[PDB]
Amino acid sequence: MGKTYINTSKTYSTPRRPYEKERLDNEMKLIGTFGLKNKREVWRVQMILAKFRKAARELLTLDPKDPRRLFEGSALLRRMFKYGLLSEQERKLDYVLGLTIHKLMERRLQTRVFKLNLANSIHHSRVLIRQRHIKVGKNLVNVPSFMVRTDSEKSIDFASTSPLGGGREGRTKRKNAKK
Amino acid sequence: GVGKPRGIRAGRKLARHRKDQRWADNDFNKRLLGSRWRNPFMGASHAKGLVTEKIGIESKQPNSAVRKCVRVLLRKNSKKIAAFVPMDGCLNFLAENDEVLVAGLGRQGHAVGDIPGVRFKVVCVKGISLLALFKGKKEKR
């Protein structure tokens, strides 16, 4: 008797033109710039940027004093702020649109750990936030595709991880036989 | 004005007109006339069958070649089927009377440009994907 009720949702987005010379070129130049793994990821991001603009357009369709806009518009922006996509001095909705996927990509646990000199590379970082080598907030973050919020961008180290805690993984297996 | 009538009171007219002038579409006319159900598979995507005999067919126009084909007998349907056996050595696996799984070739209707009156592909022998029998390291009986 199976009656699930949790919800679906695809984070993907397949492109119409399957072999756009110019499009693929950006996806790769992107995957290499952000240490991505598969084209999927790149679409996952575009799909997200979508929900924002589709909601920006949806709101721009309103009177400037619409009970709805006034409330949802602000709240959407407030969120662009917590994730730091727009700077204090970029309120107005119209700005929600001029958002580079390149900008939204930069606010990831990946893009951050590297740009925080906390790693030797855009890649080095990638295996790190993987091996738990990175804690955020009061919790530990394993998933490289974290949406790093402004407020907590301070709290990002390695709590009780070999590079702060007490290592002995490859070390132990190493020194014991040396004798 | 043009042919179509532009009255706010004449919706009915436009409506019936579209429902009518719409039969001119084959795609429409097709599914609308339970045509899909009358084909050999009875709408189905695939069909099991027994090999009635391996026959060969000649290529058409600018091509000249011996195509490999199996005459199959579909199970519940019970029809004579013309089925093209894919890749190279393929027919060398199809033993007469074995069980075969067939599917169509690009939209049920025109066969591949080359073939004559064949509308089907053979994908399984004794319930063993052909591709599998085509690559050594896979399967064989």
């Binding site: 070129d25 790769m28 130049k29 995957i31 290499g32 240490g35 991505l36 793994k37 598969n38 890649h123 990638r126 | 391996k54 060969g56 011996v66 490999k68 190279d88 050595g89 393929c90 027919l91 060398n92």
Partner: protein, 68 residues
């Protein structure tokens, strides 16, 4: 015919495959290598109109060394 089945394949001399010298990294690594061999700034550097074909290296040992 019939007995003429697969005449081709039967007649083909089975050549063997070059047993992997090392390995082919599968994962972000492969996509990485590609990024490097082609969209890395040194190739986007020289004219975008005079940059080579991602397979002119048809495996030609003579032009393989001339490039590297």
């Amino acid at each position: 015919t019939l007995a003429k089945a697969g005449k081709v394949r039967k007649q083909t001399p089975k050549v063997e495959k070059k047993d992997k010298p090392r390995k082919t990294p599968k994962g972000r690594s492969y996509k990485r290598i590609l990024y490097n061999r082609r969209y890395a700034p040194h190739i986007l550097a020289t004219d975008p109109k005079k940059r080579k074909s991602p397979n002119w290296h048809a495996g030609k040992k003579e032009k393989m060394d001339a490039a590297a």
